[PDB]
Write an enzyme that holds these catalytic residues in place. Structure first.
Site, PDB file in Angstrom:
ATOM      1  N   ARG A  61       0.835  -1.199   0.000  1.00 54.85           N
ATOM      2  CA  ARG A  61       0.000   0.000   0.000  1.00 54.85           C
ATOM      3  C   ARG A  61       0.878   1.261   0.000  1.00 54.85           C
ATOM      4  O   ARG A  61       0.831   2.059   0.945  1.00 54.85           O
ATOM      5  CB  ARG A  61      -0.923  -0.006   1.221  1.00 54.85           C
ATOM      6  CG  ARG A  61      -1.854  -1.215   1.319  1.00 54.85           C
ATOM      7  CD  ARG A  61      -2.698  -1.135   2.578  1.00 54.85           C
ATOM      8  NE  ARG A  61      -1.883  -1.337   3.770  1.00 54.85           N
ATOM      9  CZ  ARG A  61      -2.330  -1.207   5.015  1.00 54.85           C
ATOM     10  NH1 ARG A  61      -3.589  -0.852   5.241  1.00 54.85           N
ATOM     11  NH2 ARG A  61      -1.510  -1.412   6.033  1.00 54.85           N
ATOM     12  N   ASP A 116      -0.895  -8.844   5.573  1.00 59.04           N
ATOM     13  CA  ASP A 116      -2.186  -8.422   5.001  1.00 59.04           C
ATOM     14  C   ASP A 116      -3.222  -9.534   4.991  1.00 59.04           C
ATOM     15  O   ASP A 116      -4.412  -9.275   5.190  1.00 59.04           O
ATOM     16  CB  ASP A 116      -2.013  -7.869   3.588  1.00 59.04           C
ATOM     17  CG  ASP A 116      -1.262  -6.539   3.556  1.00 59.04           C
ATOM     18  OD1 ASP A 116      -0.997  -6.086   2.431  1.00 59.04           O
ATOM     19  OD2 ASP A 116      -0.967  -5.939   4.623  1.00 59.04           O
ATOM     20  N   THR A 117      -2.773 -10.771   4.797  1.00 59.22           N
ATOM     21  CA  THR A 117      -3.697 -11.908   4.836  1.00 59.22           C
ATOM     22  C   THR A 117      -4.407 -11.990   6.186  1.00 59.22           C
ATOM     23  O   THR A 117      -5.633 -12.077   6.243  1.00 59.22           O
ATOM     24  CB  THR A 117      -2.981 -13.230   4.563  1.00 59.22           C
ATOM     25  OG1 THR A 117      -1.819 -13.281   5.401  1.00 59.22           O
ATOM     26  CG2 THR A 117      -2.583 -13.335   3.100  1.00 59.22           C
ATOM     27  N   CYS A 151       0.267 -22.677   1.714  1.00 62.83           N
ATOM     28  CA  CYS A 151       0.733 -21.700   2.703  1.00 62.83           C
ATOM     29  C   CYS A 151       1.559 -22.332   3.821  1.00 62.83           C
ATOM     30  O   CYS A 151       1.078 -23.194   4.547  1.00 62.83           O
ATOM     31  CB  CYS A 151      -0.479 -21.003   3.328  1.00 62.83           C
ATOM     32  SG  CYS A 151       0.005 -19.778   4.569  1.00 62.83           S
ATOM     33  N   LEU A 152       2.793 -21.853   3.964  1.00 62.13           N
ATOM     34  CA  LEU A 152       3.643 -22.285   5.073  1.00 62.13           C
ATOM     35  C   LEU A 152       3.206 -21.784   6.429  1.00 62.13           C
ATOM     36  O   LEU A 152       3.505 -22.399   7.467  1.00 62.13           O
ATOM     37  CB  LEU A 152       5.084 -21.849   4.832  1.00 62.13           C
ATOM     38  CG  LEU A 152       5.738 -22.569   3.643  1.00 62.13           C
ATOM     39  CD1 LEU A 152       6.963 -21.805   3.136  1.00 62.13           C
ATOM     40  CD2 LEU A 152       6.070 -24.023   3.993  1.00 62.13           C
ATOM     41  N   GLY A 153       2.483 -20.676   6.402  1.00 62.81           N
ATOM     42  CA  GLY A 153       2.065 -20.006   7.612  1.00 62.81           C
ATOM     43  C   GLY A 153       0.720 -20.456   8.125  1.00 62.81           C
ATOM     44  O   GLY A 153       0.239 -19.873   9.086  1.00 62.81           O
TER      45      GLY A 153
END
Ligand code: HEM
EC number: 1.14.15.1
Length: 396
Positions: free
Chosen positions: A168, A233-234, A339-341
Site C-alpha cells: 500500500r 495483510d492476509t 501456505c507455510l504459515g
C-alpha cells in the site's frame, strides 16, 4: 481497458471480470467474485481486463491447476521472495520454513500470542469503540512476527512501514526500494545469527542447508522476507472479514459465546466463507485443459477464494454454518506452494476470537457505517468501525 480477444480464445468464453475492481464490490467482495459461479458462466473463462487472462471459476479446476505445476508455473504468480516463484529446491526451502513456522513452533508460541491479543484487546476495551482493522488487526501479525523472529519491539514502526510500502505505497518508496530497505535491515541480523544463533526463526533460517551446502545470504534474506510479508495483510484482512461478520450476526456470535469449544471449527468455516487470496500461474506450454486450448505464456488466475464458495464443494456456500460436517476450501492454497504459515494463522485467528468474545462479547458495527471491501490479490476490509458498551465487558 479491454484487450482485444486473442485469436486462440473463443468468444463464448469471454467474461470481462476485473479482479481489481469487480462490478459487484458494494455487495461484499466474496459476493462480487461469486458472480463467476453463476450458471451461465463456464468453468474456465477469459477476461479482457488487466491485459487479458484466464480465470478458473470452480474448485475442481482451481485445485487441478495448482496440482499441475508442470503446466501451471509460478514464475509469474500474480496478475498482472523465496519460495513463491519456484521442485527439489522448493522442497528443501519449504522443509526449512517448516522448521520455523511448523506446528511444534506454533504450539510453543501459542500463549505468547494469547498474551499479546489480551494486551491489545484490554487497551481498547474501556473505549467502547475502535476501528478493528487499524487498532487490533494491523498491530497484531507484525508483533507476532517479531516474537517468531526474535526481533526487538523498537524495530516495529520502521519494519511495518517497509511492509506497508510493498503493498500500500504512500509514494515515498518504490516496491524495489522498500524491498531493498527490508533486505538492508535483515542482512546484518542474518549474518550475526549465522555465527551466533539462538532458537528464533532468523537463526534457524540463517543456519539452514540447501543442496548439501549452507544457505546463502541472498537465499536467507528472501526466505525471511517472505515469512514476514506473507502473514501480514492476509491475517489483517481475514480477521477483519470475520469480525465484520460477527458484529453483524448476533446469532452466530452468541453461538460462540455459549459454546467456546466450537471456536476452532468456526475458524475453519470462516476461512471458507471469507476466503480472500487470488493468485495465478503462467502456462509453460500449449495445453488443452478441460476442453479449452491454453497457449504457452497465457496467464491464468486461480482464485483460492473461489474453491470453498463453489456450491459444488459446499452446499449453500454463502451461509455460515459452524456445524458443517465437511468444510471444503483452498483458503491457504493447494499443491506445492500451500501456505507455510497456515498453522500460525489458524492459531492467531482462534486466539483472537477466543479472547475478543470473552472480553467484549457484545459489539456492533457503528450506526450509519457502511463497511467497504477492496479487491485484488489479497482482498480485504478498508475499515471496521465497531461500538460496544464498556459495562458489558470483562476486564483483566
Ligand atoms: C489467513 C492467513 C493466510 C492466508 C489466507 C494465506 C494464504 C496463502 C496462500 C493461498 C498461499 C499460496 C499462494 C500460491 O500458491 O500462489 C500462501 C503461501 C505462503 N504463505 Fe500464507 N497465508 C496466510 C498466512 C500466512 C502467514 C501467517 C505466514 C507466515 C508466518 C504465511 C507465509 C506464507 C509463505 C512463506 C507462502 C509461500 C509458500 C510457497 O510458495 O511455497 N502465510 N499463503
Amino acid at each position: 481497458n479491454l484487450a482485444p480477444l486473442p485469436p486462440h480464445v473463443p468468444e463464448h468464453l469471454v467474461f470481462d471480470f476485473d479482479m481489481y475492481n469487480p462490478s459487484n464490490l458494494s455487495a461484499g467482495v466474496q459476493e462480487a467474485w461469486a458472480v463467476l459461479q453463476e450458471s451461465n458462466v463456464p468453468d474456465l473463462v477469459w477476461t479482457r481486463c488487466n491485459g487479458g487472462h484466464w480465470i478458473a471459476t470452480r474448485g475442481q479446476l482451481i485445485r487441478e491447476a495448482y496440482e499441475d505445476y508442470r503446466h501451471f508455473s509460478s514464475e509469474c504468480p500474480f496478475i498482472p521472495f523465496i519460495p513463491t516463484s519456484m521442485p527439489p529446491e522448493q522442497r528443501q526451502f519449504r522443509a526449512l520454513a517448516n522448521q520455523v513456522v511448523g506446528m511444534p513452533v506454533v504450539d510453543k508460541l501459542e500463549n505468547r500470542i494469547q498474551e499479546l491479543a489480551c494486551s491489545l484487546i484490554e487497551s481498547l476495551r474501556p473505549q467502547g469503540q475502535c476501528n478493528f482493522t487499524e487498532d487490533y488487526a494491523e498491530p497484531f501479525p507484525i508483533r507476532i512476527f517479531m516474537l517468531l523472529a526474535g526481533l526487538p519491539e523498537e524495530d516495529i514502526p520502521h519494519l511495518k512501514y517497509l511492509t506497508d510500502q510493498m503493498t500500500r505505497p504512500d509514494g515515498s518508496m518504490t516496491f524495489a526500494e522498500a524491498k531493498e530497505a527490508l533486505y538492508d535491515y535483515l542482512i546484518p541480523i542474518i549474518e550475526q545469527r549465522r555465527q551466533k544463533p539462538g532458537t528464533d526463526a532468523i537463526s534457524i533460517v540463517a543456519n539452514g542447508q540447501v543442496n548439501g551446502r549452507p544457505i546463502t545470504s541472498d537465499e536467507a534474506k528472501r526466505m525471511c522476507g517472505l515469512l514476514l510479508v506473507g502473514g501480514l495483510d492476509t491475517v489483517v484482512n481475514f480477521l477483519s472479514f470475520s469480525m465484520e461478520f460477527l458484529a453483524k450476526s448476533p446469532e452466530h456470535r452468541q453461538e460462540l459465546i455459549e459454546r467456546p469449544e466450537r471456536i476452532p471449527a468456526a475458524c475453519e468455516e470462516l476461512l471458507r466463507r471469507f476466503s480472500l487470496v487470488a493468485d495465478g500461474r503462467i502456462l509453460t506450454s500449449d495445453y488443452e485443459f478441460h476442453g479449452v486450448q491454453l497457449k504457452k505464456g497465457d496467464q491464468i488466475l486461480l482464485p483460492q477464494m473461489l474453491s470453498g464458495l463453489d456450491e459444488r464443494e459446499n452446499a449453500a456456500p454463502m451461509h455460515v454454518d459452524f456445524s458443517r460436517q465437511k468444510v471444503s476450501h483452498t483458503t491457504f492454497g493447494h499443491g506445492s506452494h500451500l501456505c507455510l504459515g497456515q498453522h500460525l494463522a489458524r492459531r492467531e485467528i482462534i486466539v483472537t476470537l477466543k479472547e475478543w468474545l470473552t472480553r467484549i462479547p457484545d459489539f456492533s458495527i457503528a450506526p450509519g457505517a457502511q463497511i467497504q471491501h477492496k479487491s485484488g490479490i489479497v482482498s480485504g476490509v478498508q475499515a471496521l468501525p465497531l461500538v460496544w458498551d464498556p459495562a458489558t465487558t470483562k476486564a483483566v
